[PDB]
Amino acid sequence: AVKVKVXPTKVKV
Amino acid sequence: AVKVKVXPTKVKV
Amino acid sequence: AVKVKVXPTKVKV
Amino acid sequence: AVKVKVXPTKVKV
Amino acid sequence: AVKVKVXPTKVKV
Amino acid sequence: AVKVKVXPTKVKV
Amino acid sequence: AVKVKVXPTKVKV
Amino acid sequence: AVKVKVXPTKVKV
Amino acid sequence: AVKVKVXPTKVKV
Amino acid sequence: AVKVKVXPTKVKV
Amino acid sequence: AVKVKVXPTKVKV
Amino acid sequence: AVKVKVXPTKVKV
């Protein structure tokens, strides 16, 4: 899985 | 890989 | 894709 | 979307 | 509805 | 389905 | 929300 | 590294 | 992780 | 970060 | 710096 | 940005 930030939200997918 | 959406902002990771 | 809350974080996956 | 709880772990789907 | 795993339990919600 | 993680919290959608 | 059991699987929805 | 796709544009990061 | 712009979309991967 | 270009494909990293 | 693929071309930027 | 070439690989950075 990979860490991402999209808009203001960080998350790992 | 999957579509990630945060309000109006999308991207596929 | 579905709206989800993981921990305190809302996102659409 | 609905609250889902398994043991102590709650989330929203 | 979407296939989920929450904790150790898989289910469709 | 993909594991979505926020720090040490983990689920699968 | 309520606890549901089907055979071996429980979950609260 | 992971595939990223935005609309029809794919790349790898 | 690195800030990227793919097509029109800025994100961090 | 910098524009990287390969023929007519541009991005920024 | 990060390994990237821009168009068909791999490189590290 | 400038055209750069190493062996077979050209790119513009």
State the CB neighbour count (10 A cutoff) for residue I6: 22
L11, amino acid identity: V
Give me F13's structure tokens.
Answer: 């959608």
Burial L1-13 (b: 16+ CB within 10 A, else e): eeeeeeeeeebee
CA–CA separation, I4 and I13 (whole Å)? 7
Contacts (Cβ under 8 Å, ≥6 apart) of L7: none
H/K interface, count of CB pairs below 8 Å: 14
Give me E1's structure tokens.
Answer: 């509805």
Separation in Å, CA of K11 to nearest CA in chain L: 8
Q: Cβ contact (<8 Å) for C13 and B6?
A: no
Q: Which residues of J touch K7 (CB under 8 A)?
A: 6-7, 9
Per this entry, what is the length of chain C?
13
Q: Cβ contact (<8 Å) for H6 and I2?
A: no
- What approach was used to elucidate this structure? X-ray
Q: Which residues of E touch F5 (CB under 8 A)?
A: none
Give me D10's structure tokens.
Answer: 């709650």
Please enumerate residues of I whose Cβ is less than 8 A from a Cβ of A: 1, 11-13
State the resolution, in angstroms. Answer: 2.2
